[PDB]
Design an enzyme around this catalytic site. Sequence first.
Site, PDB file in Angstrom:
ATOM      1  N   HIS A   1       0.868  -1.198   0.000  1.00  0.00           N
ATOM      2  CA  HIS A   1       0.000   0.000   0.000  1.00  0.00           C
ATOM      3  C   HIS A   1       0.898   1.239   0.000  1.00  0.00           C
ATOM      4  O   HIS A   1       1.944   1.316   0.687  1.00  0.00           O
ATOM      5  CB  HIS A   1      -0.836   0.010   1.286  1.00  0.00           C
TER       6      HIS A   1
ATOM      7  N   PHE B   1     -10.645  -1.522  21.999  1.00  0.00           N
ATOM      8  CA  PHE B   1     -10.375  -2.924  22.256  1.00  0.00           C
ATOM      9  C   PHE B   1      -9.334  -3.387  21.264  1.00  0.00           C
ATOM     10  O   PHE B   1      -9.608  -3.450  20.057  1.00  0.00           O
ATOM     11  CB  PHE B   1     -11.681  -3.694  22.160  1.00  0.00           C
TER      12      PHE B   1
HETATM   13 MG   LIG Z   1      -2.830  -3.426  -3.282  1.00  0.00          MG
END
Ligand SMILES: [Mg+2]
EC number: 2.3.3.8
Lengths: 427, 323
Positions: free
Chosen positions: B273, B298
């Site tokens: 990414h 949490f």
């Molecule tokens: Mg990707």
Amino acid sequence: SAKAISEQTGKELLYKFICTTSAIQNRFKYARVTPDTDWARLLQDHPWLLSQNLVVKPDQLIKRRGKLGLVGVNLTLDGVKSWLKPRLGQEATVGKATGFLKNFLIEPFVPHSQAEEFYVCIYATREGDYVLFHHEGGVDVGAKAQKLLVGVDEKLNPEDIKKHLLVHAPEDKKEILASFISGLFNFYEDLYFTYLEINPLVVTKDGVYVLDLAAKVDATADYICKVKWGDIEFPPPFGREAYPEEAYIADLDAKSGASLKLTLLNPKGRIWTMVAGGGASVVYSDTICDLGGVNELANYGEYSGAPSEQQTYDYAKTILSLMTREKHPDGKILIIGGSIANFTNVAATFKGIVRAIRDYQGPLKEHEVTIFVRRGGPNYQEGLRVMGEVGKTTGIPIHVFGTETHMTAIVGMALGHRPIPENLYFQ
Amino acid sequence: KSTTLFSRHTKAIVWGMQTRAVQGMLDFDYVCSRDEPSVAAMVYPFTGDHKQKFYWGHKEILIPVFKNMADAMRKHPEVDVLINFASLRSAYDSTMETMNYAQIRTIAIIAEGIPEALTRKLIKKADQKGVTIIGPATVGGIKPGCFKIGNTGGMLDNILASKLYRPGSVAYVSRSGGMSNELNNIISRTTDGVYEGVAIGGDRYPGSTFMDHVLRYQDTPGVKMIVVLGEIGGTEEYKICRGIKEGRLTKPIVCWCIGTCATMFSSEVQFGHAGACANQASETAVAKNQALKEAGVFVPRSFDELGEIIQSVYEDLVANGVI
Ligand SMILES: [Mg+2]
Ligand SMILES: Nc1ncnc2c1ncn2[C@@H]1O[C@H](COP(=O)(O)OP(=O)(O)O)[C@@H](O)[C@H]1O
Ligand SMILES: *c1nc2c(N)ncnc2n1[C@@H]1O[C@H](CO)[C@@H](O)[C@H]1O
Ligand SMILES: O=C(O)C[C@@](O)(C(=O)O)[C@@H](O)C(=O)O
């Protein structure tokens, strides 16, 4: 992603393309030196290296080089060669990264007072680009610089710069500073920079000198910017080297909308991954390292975006080549993992992997490679079958799991933390 | 921006020749017992106005393909969503053009590789018009019973496996597309299942951020708990911590940030990414996870315990009659 460029690359671009009224001094006066340099030829190309004293420093994305004793200041050429002897070609640790010092830059020394050093930076954020200016440039720059947000559609004129940023600047330098910064900002925008820092920028009675430059460009803009970028290079971080496998996989990645990415972290590592998906590949890596195996993790890598069976074969063949370069006492491991794909054809992709395993079955056995597979998505049952099938037909041990196993369970398996539950095979 | 983006009456335009993703949407529609296909029409500049075969259940039907976006819009004024499969080169232009049509309230941008400087401009204009951008570089999202963006959630067998044909009470937001389908699988095995899930994509500047959707979910009464799959890079997740501290966020949130391994590498590694890159210590997964934990979120020990804490929170919500 945004990718750092070398100081030399950035400076050539700025020297080529910046528009200013400023006289920018010493344009293109820099030389590159490596352990393989032919210094006679270097001096044939750069006679100015004899004309005045010099500065030498590595150009390998090292920060804080002055604080590291890695900037040689005001040296004769002979002084440069002496400074480089204990450095050029030497292993060096910076922060926690260890690499060889192999690429250095030589430039005219520029006499000046400390009052002639200025800091300029421009960096991208969601809401636009911030422009930073300080009249205390230099290695001791240390919430004290003037800083201005330039919005996504805003323009930055000299007039704006004097107004917002140059309030603390010597009055006689405001015009040339404003002109240069406006030009730098235009340059920054037109060439799709995301970070550009000049520390220090020097301005003497003779004009504007760019003594240091650090920058990132948005590499995705190649299709827009290639004419001006030219054959731009994106160096690894200091501490890593580039392998042709990485450049090979990258070439594959650039040809299709499919994503194919390989980074070698430790070629001698016994833990290899061929994971589908950005997030998943991160997660497995997280797990391999949470479970102690960071020193044995050989690579970060992900395919995705529905690679074809051919693209998938060529990815896998590279992995399998790199883990059969050198044996290991304890053998090797391969984690063929992923989430439940949204649209990647598991059967098409694993048929590419199977064929690559089939081609490398001999070497894989001689390196005691053990394979663990977990995967979901379209046609994943046929994907799993063909992994089990090649496992038998080659003697290799392949342990094939499906949506019923937790995604990362296979890593605990492959490292001994937990037993191999054969009661989930192909499920 | 808005709270509700999709319903079982949502109609979409698909930009691009993506017959597989459109068919998969219609299969989703059919088992969710939608009255009508969710794809009203397709735009493809590379061909002229025509019609494509598709299957609505067993029945062959016709979706109109337009060469011009302005025709598709004018003929189908019921459309308020566009799913943009334009390649990276074209996505910016077509997305700007979509936002000249006030009927469009949500845009999914599928393409990876859009320059960040362009996505910022998309965001300025979307923000201007109130349009919700999901993406870029995302598979999309899925609202069980209602609507599915593109390939999200795969073929029917997975829609049925993870019970994505009716809403539960658990909403989520993820940066990862593939992991969103893992969350689908985990949530459906540990709760009454997904109410709505969105992948915001991996880019530095996503069109809608985590907090954008976390708030929508806080204001949807069908939503009783929220899951967030964060990631190393940027400081978005801290807005969750803020939103609890301020009393804006009251429903239980589970969250885990991936990329902890980066803390252990001796050099910077760019994950898949485009945004998954920490530029300061706070941008690390480890720092973010730790700050979430102290804020009341949490937070499991590792992704491996993710399923267990989701179930833990869900069961307590049932015990106390919230679900
Ligand atoms: Mg990707
Ligand atoms: N060409 C030069 N002429 C004069 N001084 C220089 C020159 N290049 C660098 N310096 C000085 O050396 C210091 C360290 O150099 P710099 O290139 O900024 O590296 P780093 O920022 O990594 O320490 C600078 O602050 C500046 O004072
Ligand atoms: C460039 N400059 C060189 C010096 N000074 N020594 C050794 N090799 C040198 N090169 C290489 O030669 C190519 C041009 O023929 C350059 O691209 C560089 O690789
Ligand atoms: O193959 C996967 O598991 C990921 C992916 O290819 C998918 O099919 O879901 C896609 O989501 C991506 O990662 O870009």
